[PDB]
Amino acid sequence: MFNLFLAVFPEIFIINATFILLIHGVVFSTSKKYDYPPLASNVGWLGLLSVLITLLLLAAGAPLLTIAHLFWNNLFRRDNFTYFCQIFLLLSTAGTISMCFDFFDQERFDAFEFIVLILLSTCGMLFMISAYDLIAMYLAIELQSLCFYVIAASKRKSEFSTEAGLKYLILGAFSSGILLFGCSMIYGSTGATHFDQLAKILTGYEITGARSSGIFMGILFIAVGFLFKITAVPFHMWAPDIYEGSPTPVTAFLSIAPKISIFANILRVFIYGSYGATLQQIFFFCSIASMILGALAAMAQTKVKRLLAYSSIGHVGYICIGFSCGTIEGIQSLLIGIFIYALMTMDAFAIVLALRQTRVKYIADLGALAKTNPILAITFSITMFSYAGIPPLAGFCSKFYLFFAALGCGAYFLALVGVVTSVIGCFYYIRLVKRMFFDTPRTWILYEPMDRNKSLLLAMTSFFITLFLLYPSPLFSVTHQMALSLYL
Amino acid sequence: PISATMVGALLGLGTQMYSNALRKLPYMRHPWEHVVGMGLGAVFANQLVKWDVKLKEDLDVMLAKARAANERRYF
Amino acid sequence: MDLIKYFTFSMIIFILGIWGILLNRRNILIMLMSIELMLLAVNLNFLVFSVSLDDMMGQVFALLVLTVAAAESAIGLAIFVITFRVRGTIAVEFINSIQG
Amino acid sequence: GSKKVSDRIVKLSAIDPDGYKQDIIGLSGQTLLRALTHTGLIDPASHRLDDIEACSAECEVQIAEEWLEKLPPRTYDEEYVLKRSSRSRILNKHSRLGCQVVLTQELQGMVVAVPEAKPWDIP
Amino acid sequence: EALDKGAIEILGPYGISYTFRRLAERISQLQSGFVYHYAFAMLLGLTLFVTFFCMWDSLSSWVDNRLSFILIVSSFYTK
Amino acid sequence: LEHFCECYFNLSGLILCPVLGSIILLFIPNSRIRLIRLIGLCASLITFLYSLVLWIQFDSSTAKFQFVESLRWLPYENINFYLGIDGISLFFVILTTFLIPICILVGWSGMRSYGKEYIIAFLICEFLMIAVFCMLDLLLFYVFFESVLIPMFIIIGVWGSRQRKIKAAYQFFLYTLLGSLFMLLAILLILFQTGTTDLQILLTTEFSERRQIFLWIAFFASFAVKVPMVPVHIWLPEAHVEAPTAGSVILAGILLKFGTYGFLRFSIPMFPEATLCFTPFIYTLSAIAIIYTSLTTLRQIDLKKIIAYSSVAHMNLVTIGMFSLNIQGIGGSILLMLSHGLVSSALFLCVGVLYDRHKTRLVRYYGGLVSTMPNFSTIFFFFTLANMSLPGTSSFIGEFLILVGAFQRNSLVATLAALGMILGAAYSLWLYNRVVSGNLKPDFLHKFSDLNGREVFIFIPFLVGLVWMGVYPKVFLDCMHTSVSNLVQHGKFH
Ligand SMILES: CCCCCCCCCCCCCCCCCC(=O)O[C@@H](COC(=O)CCCCCCCCCCCCCCC)COP(=O)(O)OCC[N+](C)(C)C
Ligand SMILES: CCCCCCCCCCCCCCCCCC(=O)O[C@@H](COC(=O)CCCCCCCCCCCCCCC)COP(=O)(O)OC[C@H](O)CO
């Protein structure tokens, strides 16, 4: 009996460690004897340790995660794809946590519950990746969402943070209701919620004239929920406001991990299921809309956070092009784009968090940065050029596959749109470089140097961004492996 | 020649220096950290090369199974 | 005709929630209430289908969805409370400062 | 010494959101925002540059038309910032961006109303 | 003056910059800051999804794809 | 397949030289200005000598690629990349390696404020441009060309003289990136047919007349922006004027040549039928550019603006030559490319000598400089003559060989192209006489200094090269004929 639970050792450990940290934090934060010490950094270090131990347990027990698969079948499904997805999610959570300590001590954000909520949301996203039934998927999505709602409003006396939370909760709850409605329609039409059963029922028919309008609209509503989650246009406008109004570590965490988890879900639901061309057209139209609107709106922005939010919207458009074309290379390119976008976003938010110690808000606040911190201005410039997709930086991979998918599938309008939006993006990315290197403002802002954690993370992500295309084989192989494991 | 150990050691040393520079510290502020970084970089690079070999090995079998499943169509 | 009548009941509840979103641009509390109405309609959809299909999966998920609805309302009303506390008012013109 | 700071000083009066009138001091050639930040009437941390690209109307002031005729007319960008920063999205005809008003000797005695501070410190 | 700094600038960097600035301006204004607009947009997107992707069976008798995309673009030139 | 070459001096080490210089300079404190200056200068000079050696081991009888060596990207070996040169690319490698030390020398006096970033940017540019000229693969040609945009952007924006450098840099980056994206689209369409981007294979595949038309247009959209051809030439005056002196030298002398190199290297041999179909189109565009841009040059009031507009007329003559598709045409196009790279660079250096002292580009302020700067006046006159294609100078050889090539194909295009002899003389002599001749205007300028030793030394190799190519172009043409001949014949078998 005990050995059956080897399939959930990683999750058991992280949940138990989260409980231990909750108890530790609440017991000593309330201690008069110890004079109510702030425990955000102490619990943060212990939680980083817990995340790393979870990663060790998961990575080193690759075969064991598939033990007792028949017993666990109606609860979740662990395979090669979920293996690598969960590893990448844990690595992202560890990096995001490591970027938070200067924020904890200098702002004096003393709430250790922040770390606990991050860990519980990580548990939720882990269960999201392995979900193999509509019920499990919904429950894990809701756990993740509720944790985000709470942490988005963590600055509870701030107008901005409270506004972010309110908008997030209302729009999140609305989208979740729409998705749940879709799930109910699919169950009513097919008598099934398990992904295997849905695959068997729906395969071979798609729209064979006598199409289940119940099945067709259930798929549509579920897709609407998914598109809200990935911040695809027109279900996107929550994202810029929430990203700007939340505390910056929250914004960094939301920018990466939920995308990993929800794309895992989207792959395993749609790609593994079957209504077909309709849904790929959904993601097609939403990709084009996201690219255009992200480019234009980002061009309008004068503030750093809003610029990065709109940039992420545009990039999810680029990524969803891969899901749309419905090929093994499409899935592989989508995974490559997520990995690279995640490492670039981690780099960018490490810089943003470093600069938030002097309250960076506007793009113009970067003036004369090439004088006051030359190596920081260069590092940030490499990130921008990578965001623009200039070769041979890592960001060039997404542009290359965008045009690779258009030319082959025959999509000349998509290629047109990609060219235009890439040029617009390059303009608003090099505007930052111009501000740091070319401008001569009358008043300068002198920034405090970053802590060791962010400097090390920045140093590694900056080598990756510059040097990835010298040795890209492991990512290429691992992502081809994952794309294949979805069906075999 | 240019071995994974040497590339990794150079990358680790560069990482420590880049980290010091980002913090506006002298390049060689804590030299024992430079030694630690060279060691970790060498270890990382060697493990990445071995992992790459293993990854290609697994992808080979998996492509083989995909090809067999596809070829079953023409039976 | 039973199944079409049970489904249109839940359907009118869902459409009422949608209309409540549409008609309450100055009243975000009612917007939250409309979202609960939609969640209730979905829950009813699972229960009706469970009976019609003679299957228990609709019933397990209905209970779990009730748990989600409870947690959602708790957290949402907390966020409403803190927004009101910061502003002293619930009017929508005082929660429009993030834009662009 | 034939060149004094007194040669550039511009006498000003500011009415705080509570309505009380205060006599403040600024240099000619510098912005109204700087004069207002000298005594903390506007928080200097909320508006650190004198550039329109780093402005969310934290510098906004209200000036009667007798002094408005003595200023250059509002540019399109200024009105854009003022209107979008308005809670009701309405452009106040007596509103000026303090960071865009350069003090001169001709503005001696100008009366300025400082509205209640808007939230500025993005999490 | 008529070509290099005239027509080629207007149907080039000068004109392009002008139009893309005005359009980025308009798209930024859609992010109005009102939660009601964001919910309305989601409802409109959901309605669009149902309408185009399932209720375009009979439509085709009255409707053409040409007119669809023409009226879309034409909307840009309103007021 | 490992294509490793026997030769000791090869292409990879010449790639590595400025890279190593840049890494070393990364770590040297800005207080050690002398060390930074010397290290950068010496790295550039060693690269130049290495390229000279590469010229000696060159074999002028084969139509093949030489020093071919290979470069292996994945263990799967599906994608493996090759470097190699021929008689069309050799002298461009040499010109790049020669110009970079000149750029380091021009900023010698201001290096205390320039810093190591200036030298590092120029060394990185050198590495990227040599790579571009040495690539036997469409996709890496793409990757290495776009990469130069970043350091060029930085060079223009940081060390440009005035705030117009902002707009100039934006326009340079955006125009060039648009063209580059068009050619990326072309590269992917080719890859879908062939499954490869290796230049040698594409030279041996057959493209449909239809597929050739589309691929040619997509190549043209990059290359015409690069050349530049009208009407996408307007980025060039802004960028080449607002850049610092060495930045202008690199822009005019090397970066402009990349479009004509792309025409010579991929478009003409890969799609000969499309090349034939588009020849009247290219002839018309180039002839319009020569006449209209020369006449615009005549009415410019800024020194740098006059020299920058002159380059548009010269490059479109180059395009006429290369699309004539015979020995005179292609040989003259290559020779004029190299000669322009020397002459326009020297002219930008002359204007920079004037601007460093007086800080104005407006012609009206100058005048009568022959009486205070006779050495500068003489050197300026020599390069003015070279820019008019005076026989005896290097530019005349390429100009006349291109007119020969064009006349044998179409007498009208040769006739329109020979009008350049009249218009270029007009603007060149007008510029020279308004700057150097006449009386001084002491109310504008009253203090003067002729060239120092560094400036004289900088000018010496330009003079030597101009005269050397002008009087004995056989040294260059002998190393190029086999490659040029095989380019002209490619696609036909009679
Ligand atoms: C070719 C790529 C495509 C195009 C993209 C180009 C992107 C860059 C744009 C080029 C234009 C010019 C760029 C100028 C940058 C050069 C100046 C520079 O970065 O110098 C840095 C140097 O920045 C670095 O630290 C770079 C370190 C990266 C390490 C990479 C090398 C890896 C192996 C080396 C092993 C160690 C050294 C071996 C020899 C001792 C000095 O930084 P500061 O902020 O001035 O001061 C730092 C503080 N302190 C000196 C006291 C320590
Ligand atoms: C994609 C191809 C486009 C060009 C097609 C060929 C040419 C067709 C005919 C010309 C079309 C554009 C006509 C523009 C009329 C002038 C509009 C105007 O007012 O000009 C303004 C500038 O705007 C333009 O000229 C528009 C430039 C358009 C250039 C092309 C648009 C963008 C194309 C690229 C993006 C889309 C790519 C699609 C690719 C298929 C000047 O601004 P102002 O405020 O000073 O005007 C005051 C006024 O004169 C009264 O006093």
Ligand SMILES: CCCCCCCCCCCCCCCCCCCC(=O)O[C@H](COC(=O)CCCCCCCCCCCCCC)COP(=O)(O)OCCN
């Ligand atoms: C792939 C491209 C090439 C990459 C190059 C690879 C080379 C390997 C790297 C070599 C590293 C060189 C330096 C090693 C010596 C430094 C040792 C750290 C000292 C230490 O204990 O640091 C503590 C902080 O932790 C820290 O600062 C450590 C945390 C740093 C964050 C990184 C790890 C986070 C988790 C994983 C992130 C993954 C993200 C990817 C998605 C205390 O510091 P202190 O004593 O100065 O006091 C700080 C004030 N509180």
Ligand SMILES: CCCCCCCCCCCCCCCCCCCC(=O)O[C@H](COC(=O)CCCCCCCCCCCCCC)COP(=O)(O)OCCN
């Ligand atoms: C074999 C070469 C490499 C070995 C490195 C040591 C052995 C590996 C053990 C892990 C080392 C990781 C890096 C340790 C330092 C991490 C960053 C600590 C910096 C910090 O903020 O806290 C400092 C603690 O010092 C410290 O943490 C250092 C405490 C003493 C360690 C230094 C001795 C290293 C021995 C190197 C070879 C010795 C040869 C004989 C065996 C207090 O800083 P502070 O106030 O003390 O002063 C600093 C003057 N800026």
Ligand SMILES: CCCCCCCCCCCCCCCCCCCC(=O)O[C@H](COC(=O)CCCCCCCCCCCCCC)COP(=O)(O)OCCN
């Ligand atoms: C045979 C027929 C064909 C033959 C060829 C004819 C071609 C006609 C000419 C087309 C080429 C145009 C190339 C575009 C370059 C635009 C450069 C404008 C940039 C510039 O200098 O001003 C900026 C404006 O950027 C902005 O705000 C605007 C955004 C940047 C512009 C990029 C948009 C281009 C996208 C693609 C357009 C063409 C489609 C291709 C099919 C700065 O402005 P600021 O001062 O306000 O900024 C704040 C300052 N830091």
Ligand SMILES: COC1=C(OC)C(=O)C(C/C=C(\C)CC/C=C(\C)CC/C=C(/C)CC/C=C(\C)CCC=C(C)C)=C(C)C1=O
């Ligand atoms: C400057 O003058 C003015 C206008 O002009 C732009 C206006 O009209 C408006 C605003 C009114 C509008 C445009 C309402 C329409 C909003 C919609 C459609 C909500 C959808 C959400 C967004 C943000 C747009 C994105 C939607 C797309 C791209 C379509 C869906 C995506 C796919 C193709 C799958 C105002 C106030 C105005 O004063």
Ligand SMILES: [Fe+3]
């Ligand atoms: Fe202001």
